Amino acid sequence: AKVKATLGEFDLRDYRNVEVLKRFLSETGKILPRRRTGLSAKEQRILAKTIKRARILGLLPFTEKLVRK
Amino acid sequence: PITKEEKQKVIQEFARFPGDTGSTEVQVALLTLRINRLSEHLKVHKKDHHSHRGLLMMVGQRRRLLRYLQREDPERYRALIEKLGIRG
Amino acid sequence: GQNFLIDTNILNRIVDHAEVTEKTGVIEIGPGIGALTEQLAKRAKKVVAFEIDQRLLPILKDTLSPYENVTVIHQDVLKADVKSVIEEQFQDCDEIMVVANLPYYVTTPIIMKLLEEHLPLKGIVVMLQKEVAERMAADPSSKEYGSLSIAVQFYTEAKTVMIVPKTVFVPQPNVDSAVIRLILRDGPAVDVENESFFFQLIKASFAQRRKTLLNNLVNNLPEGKAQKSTIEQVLEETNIDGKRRGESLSIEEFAALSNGLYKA
Amino acid sequence: KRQVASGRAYIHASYNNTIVTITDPDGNPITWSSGGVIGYKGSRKGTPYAAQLAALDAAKKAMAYGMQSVDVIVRGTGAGREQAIRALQASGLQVKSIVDDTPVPHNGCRPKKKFRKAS
Amino acid sequence: MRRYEVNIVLNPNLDQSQLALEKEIIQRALENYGARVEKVEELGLRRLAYPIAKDPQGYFLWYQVEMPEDRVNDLARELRIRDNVRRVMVVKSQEPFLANA
RNA sequence: GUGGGAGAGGGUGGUGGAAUUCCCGGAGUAGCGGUGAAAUGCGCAGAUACCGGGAGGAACGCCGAUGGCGAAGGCAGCCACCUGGUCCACCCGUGACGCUGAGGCGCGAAAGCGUGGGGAGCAAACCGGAUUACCCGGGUAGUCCACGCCCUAAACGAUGCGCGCUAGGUCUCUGGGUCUCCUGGGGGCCGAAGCUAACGCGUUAAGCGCGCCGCCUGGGGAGUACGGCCGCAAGGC
């Protein structure tokens, strides 16, 4: 199930819509590929830009630790 | 950048007749303005090699347009060169 | 077993190049299989074989029945003193030669250290690679020039006696083999204050070859590291040496430079 | 000695060796164990069996300090991560969570000759 | 005279006094550098995914301004001098490009 | 010209985190590290695991693409400024103002070099170890910056540029419209006619044509010798 599917209506250039932004990051603080997100490249590119910008703001994690062996 | 204001002002200044946006004089004027801006930019930014190619092409275009203008009508050529102070 | 030469023709030619006669004496280094030893002993007054290989010696030793001049000494030439050999085994023939067809990774340091050992012998003829042969026998302003040429210039004037095809060697080396001759000079080629200091200088000059003599001597020299601030007078002490390199200069130039260095 | 009653066990699982360190929440290392302290040398230092023995040894020598529960984070990509974790959890200390915190560069320093040629 | 958005994150470990003085001084600088604020969004405290300046907490403040383009760098360098502010990031105002309309 | 679009195109300042290496502490016991297996090496002056604080340099993990930009060489964190190229739409202005281009001028990966800075990591040369009678431990220039040289490559699509005509199918990037689809531009894979010694190319031609330029005339000798020009030199034409 693509991450896009389990979502409604939002804006991508909004680098403060933090709650939706946690969705597009994996179990680790990594940006999910197009296979998981379910967007077009343009959307993926702009989303990655926004994600990095938010990371700079400290609203999002650069990296995390995964609860698994 | 060259905002709409001064661009339109130059177009109005150098137009042969009202509603002329593409004549030789207008083209030469716009190219001259762009050349001036890029020249000063490259003066400040010496090691911007990529922009220098653009400058060369713009200068070439202006030279070709001036050549045609001189060929077809020399009086307009002299008037334009004195107006814009090209070639010195 | 390394690449072993199997040609009687080129072996005869090389042993001729060695001038192995009745009067001539032979030092054998790494007798190995015993083809070179075969071609040497029959025309040599006394052959002294040095080797440290475990079993390459006593097997060959069996074949040494017809030869009466085969005084094989089992030891490493580098580790073991050779001074005593001159007195003990050259009573038959005072003339000295060293002949080798060994691998070069062992041969070249052996030759260097033997020359360092300061044993006065007439000459040496060894088998080496084309590139290293060019390196030793080199002229000024060459890509094949370096510190090795400078080192060998004191001892001998060299020339590759006979270029060797790769075919003769069992496994074939990719690069051509070229046998050189090293016949010891009467004494030092050019005088110097200190030999060790001379060597340090030549190392410093050719450390970063491409850079200017000045840039080499600034950073390479340890005493240069000490007198970095003082290199001004070092520039002053230079005579007719402008913006220059190492390769540009010759033996006499470097000798005069060293003699000047002592006066700093 | 300390009796924190709740610490954390670090598992440094390299290719050549596995290291297990148990420590308090304050990061103060109470003790440690490795494949080397068991007696294994050379190649067999990083074997999964060595990881098992190291985990058990660390657990045993930690029980003396009264440790009962730990929260483990594993480091390195060595062959014996799974073996070490299973041995540790089956030693007598109730692990709360199992986590990895393997350090990965963000294309920083230039690696060794062998570890180069990254896709 | 382009429209920019201005972001300031500053020390949460400040009472009303330091907060107010910082706000007024940064507004002073804003109006100093030829800027003209329209609207202000106040976000109070938010948890950070990683600690900045040894602090896991941060105070947020948001502006969107239309101001001279040549002076935005000057404003950014000015606002960053104080030790009470951690990150200052000035970005150009972007149109809401919607998704899956 | 007007109204829009995408982009690691370039230059200048600012600063975000993860590593790596050192320094300062707290705790910590006997190894750590390394290999096909080992040795060198570090560690009782308390190493390696690990917690915190600080310094410094270099490079930007996922996104990431068989993707995009550029005339090539090349270009990946983020922010802002100054700029280069390009696509579509309206058909609005001009009237052939165009193509190519001997010399000239400029750009030109990496490695070198001069004059000054910087040096975390890697690492020519070099110091060690060892075995299969390459590989592991250290380390200099160099890789980093400013200015000035050098002008070389499997600098390759081994395919010069511009324009016109000649079936389509499929996957992508980016626009526009009346939006199952039409219409442009860019990048791949099959394949009509056709071409080729063959492999193969095929609307991004190596097809059918036109214009201009640059080269080829058996293999070595030889990119050598002499002469000339350009560089501090190595060297380049």
Curated annotation (Swiss-Prot), chain A:
Disulfide bonds: none annotated. Keywords: Ribonucleoprotein, Ribosomal protein, RNA-binding, rRNA-binding. GO terms for biological process: translation. One of its GO terms (molecular function) is structural constituent of ribosome. The keyword Ribosomal protein applies. GO terms for cellular component: ribonucleoprotein complex; ribosome. Belongs to the bacterial ribosomal protein bS18 family. Part of the 30S ribosomal subunit. Forms a tight heterodimer with protein bS6, also interacts with protein uS11. Binds to the C-terminus of IF3 and to the central section of Era. Located on the back of the platform of the 30S subunit where it stabilizes the close packing of several RNA helices of the 16S rRNA. Forms part of the Shine-Dalgarno cleft in the 70S ribosome, where it probably interacts with the Shine-Dalgarno helix. This is Small ribosomal subunit protein bS18. The gene is rpsR. The chain holds residues 20 to 88 of 88 of the full protein.
UniProtKB/Swiss-Prot annotation, chain B:
The keyword RNA-binding applies. GO terms for molecular function: rRNA binding; structural constituent of ribosome. Keywords: Ribonucleoprotein, Ribosomal protein, RNA-binding, rRNA-binding. The keyword RNA-binding applies. InterPro entries: Ribosomal_uS15, Ribosomal_uS15_bac-type, uS15_NS1_RNA-bd_sf. Disulfide bonds: none annotated. GO terms for biological process: translation. SUPFAM superfamilies: S15/NS1 RNA-binding domain. GO terms for cellular component: cytosolic small ribosomal subunit. CDD domains: Ribosomal_S15p_S13e. Transmembrane segments: none annotated. Part of the 30S ribosomal subunit. Forms a bridge to the 50S subunit in the 70S ribosome, contacting the 23S rRNA. Belongs to the universal ribosomal protein uS15 family. One of the primary rRNA binding proteins, it binds directly to 16S rRNA where it helps nucleate assembly of the platform of the 30S subunit by binding and bridging several RNA helices of the 16S rRNA. Forms an intersubunit bridge (bridge B4) with the 23S rRNA of the 50S subunit in the ribosome. This is Small ribosomal subunit protein uS15. It comes from Thermus thermophilus (strain ATCC 27634 / DSM 579 / HB8). The gene is rpsO.
UniProtKB/Swiss-Prot annotation, chain D:
The keyword Calcium does not apply. SUPFAM superfamilies: Translational machinery components. It comes from the Bacteria. The keyword Repeat does not apply. One of its GO terms (cellular component) is ribonucleoprotein complex. Residues 99-119 are annotated as: Disordered. One of its GO terms (biological process) is translation. Residues 109-119 have a biased composition (Basic residues). One of its GO terms (molecular function) is structural constituent of ribosome. Keywords: Ribonucleoprotein, Ribosomal protein, RNA-binding, rRNA-binding. Located on the upper part of the platform of the 30S subunit, where it bridges several disparate RNA helices of the 16S rRNA. Forms part of the Shine-Dalgarno cleft in the 70S ribosome, where it interacts both with the Shine-Dalgarno helix and mRNA. Belongs to the universal ribosomal protein uS11 family. Part of the 30S ribosomal subunit. Interacts with proteins S7 and S18. Binds to the C-terminus of IF-3; however exactly how IF-3 interacts with the 30S subunit is unclear. May contact the C-terminus of Era. This is Small ribosomal subunit protein uS11. It comes from Thermus thermophilus (strain ATCC 27634 / DSM 579 / HB8). The gene is rpsK.
From Swiss-Prot, chain E:
It comes from the Bacteria. SUPFAM superfamilies: Ribosomal protein S6 (SSF54995). GO terms for biological process: translation. Disulfide bonds: none annotated. One of its GO terms (cellular component) is ribonucleoprotein complex. PROSITE patterns: RIBOSOMAL_S6. Pfam families: Ribosomal_S6. Belongs to the bacterial ribosomal protein bS6 family. Located on the outer edge of the platform on the body of the 30S subunit. This is Small ribosomal subunit protein bS6. It comes from Thermus thermophilus (strain ATCC 27634 / DSM 579 / HB8). The gene is rpsF.
